[PDB]
Curated annotation (Swiss-Prot), chains A, B:
It comes from the Viruses. This is 3C-like proteinase nsp5. It comes from Severe acute respiratory syndrome coronavirus 2 (2019-nCoV). There is a cross-link at residues 5, 90 (Glycyl lysine isopeptide (Lys-Gly) (interchain with G-Cter in ubiquitin)). The chain holds residues 3264 to 3569 of 7096 of the full protein. Changing residue 132 to H: In strain: Omicron/BA.1, Omicron/BA.2, Omicron/BA.2.12.1, Omicron/BA.2.75, Omicron/BA.4, Omicron/BA.5, Omicron/BQ.1.1, Omicron/XBB.1.5, Omicron/EG.5.1.
Length: 306, 306
């Protein structure tokens, strides 16, 4: 028993992280097959980032202007191209440590593990969620750009995030592995506004089911509610609206615990109106929304990877 | 910027996890060089665990009674021995993926990463602390026994924990890699009492320094205090006493932020007497004690590994 903010094993990703250096800037890159993916602002100086013309800046660069290192072995760049906001550096050697992988664009509310790297070397791994406003509350220092987010399905590694920048508000923004930003952000050092950040209601409900499974049950109460009645209360407290697709995803958890989804919503409704009263749920004094229904099932059953 | 409960990259440990099977019981083992370490109760049935005579139970077993698997390759057991509560299975093949490693016995308050495994396959990684009562609040299901805890110093892997059992209270207990239990626990299914769990004050202070570094400063107040004055307040709220060695460890953080250790203690004193008043520090409504002073420095500077 017990419940922890668990991240995927990062072994398969550590073997794909390399150090990419262009001119004076150095950041991390993802080496899969004979292609190295990295943020395109590696071709920028600190001055260029204020208002960069990436096309004009890439004209000045040649294949030999890029230094790709994997630990202590060098990689020769044979070709280069810009796909949206990522750079694709074609190298001569195919990464022998390439695992089975896909490129996936996740939706808000979904969770993934981040492997923070600096100078192509892994430093730590943690779990986080894609906020409804397409930002993540990560932990990134200068030089962490190019760090990737990923999920693991048995033997396949689904890459879903590449870190590109920290916003002036302290939150973080990035792209998928095709170079398309999550949200309305651009790879430029300017004041960019992130929308209102809302709580992922479906994740909170899944978290409450994990609490019941692990012995926390004080929040279970006497009432029930309707979808519209709850969504009305939820919107006042900046909670995502609950749809029928969310009820369907929680089905397996409802069957395990014998608590109807709508009954759990009534419990959450009271928690929203009356607070926690100094109590804790799974050791947390706040309502957690970084566990998806699949994460809860995964951790409460023991799904593994190879 | 930002601050996350970060775990070490588990790549170097995933290559050492194997599946150990004796008779009918199967759990995880740590394969280093030509020795496989695993909990000794792998030789026990569900009936034996109530009151096991491990010596008499090991007499009945021979080298061929142990099935060691690494993914899909078999390992032939050449020798076996019992060191305290761990079993050391000498095999014919030396693990090629053996990293530089030490065996370390940590002290309470220190943190480490846990790689939860089932049937020798990694499933997740999370960070936790050794409670002052020599337990850990982990996430372990049946078959997770043998999962190891570890730290990483650049290129060396320090193994410090092997999971052995879950106590009736839901908390978890284990040994070092020499088989010595942390705490007064024995590898037997009986009612075992864990001491009073206290908060790791030095870790809370380090966490507060991380908050100041990341922009959270409302808890900084006007007062100061003495070591004895604070320790008096701390003991009432079940906080570990603060010694001069703790003040010395926090020195670098005090120099970075310009806030004297004793001044930070005064801030924590008020938080203990008046609570948080519905506010949050680094997104947490409770006082976090699972970050050591070294963890904070590590995450706020960007120390990496290879
Ligand atoms: Zn950058
Ligand atoms: Zn066991």
């Amino acid at each position: 028993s017990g419940f922890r903010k668990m991240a995927f094993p990062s072994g398969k990703v550590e073997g794909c992280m390399v150090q990419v250096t262009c001119g004076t800037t150095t950041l991390n890159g993802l080496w899969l097959d004979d292609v190295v993916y990295c943020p395109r602002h590696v071709i920028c100086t600190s001055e260029d980032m204020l208002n960069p013309n990436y096309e004009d800046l890439l004209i000045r660069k040649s294949n030999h202007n890029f230094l790709v290192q994997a630990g202590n072995v060098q990689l020769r760049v044979i070709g280069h191209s810009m796909q949206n906001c990522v750079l694709k550096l074609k190298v001569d050697t195919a990464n022998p440590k390439t695992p089975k992988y896909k490129f996936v664009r996740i939706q808000p509310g979904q969770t993934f593990s981040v492997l923070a790297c600096y100078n192509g070397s892994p430093s730590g791994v943690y779990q986080c969620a894609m906020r409804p406003n397409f930002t993540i509350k990560g932990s990134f220092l200068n030089g962490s750009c190019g760090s990737v987010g990923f999920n693991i399905d048995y033997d396949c590694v689904s890459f879903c995030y590449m870190h590109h920048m920290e916003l002036p508000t302290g939150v973080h923004a990035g792209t998928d592995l095709e170079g398309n930003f999550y949200g309305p952000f651009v790879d430029r050092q300017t004041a960019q506004a992130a929308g209102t950040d809302t709580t992922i209601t479906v994740n909170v409900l899944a978290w409450l089911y994990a609490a019941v499974i692990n012995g926390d049950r004080w929040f279970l109460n006497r009432f029930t509610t309707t979808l519209n009645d709850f969504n009305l209360v939820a919107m006042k407290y900046n909670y995502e609206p609950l749809t029928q697709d969310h009820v369907d995803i929680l089905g397996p958890l409802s069957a395990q615990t014998g608590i109807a989804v709508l009954d759990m919503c009534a419990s959450l409704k009271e928690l929203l109106q009356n607070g926690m009263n100094g109590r804790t749920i799974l050791g947390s004094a706040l309502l957690e929304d970084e566990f998806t229904p699949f994460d809860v099932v995964r951790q409460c059953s023991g799904v593994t990877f190879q």
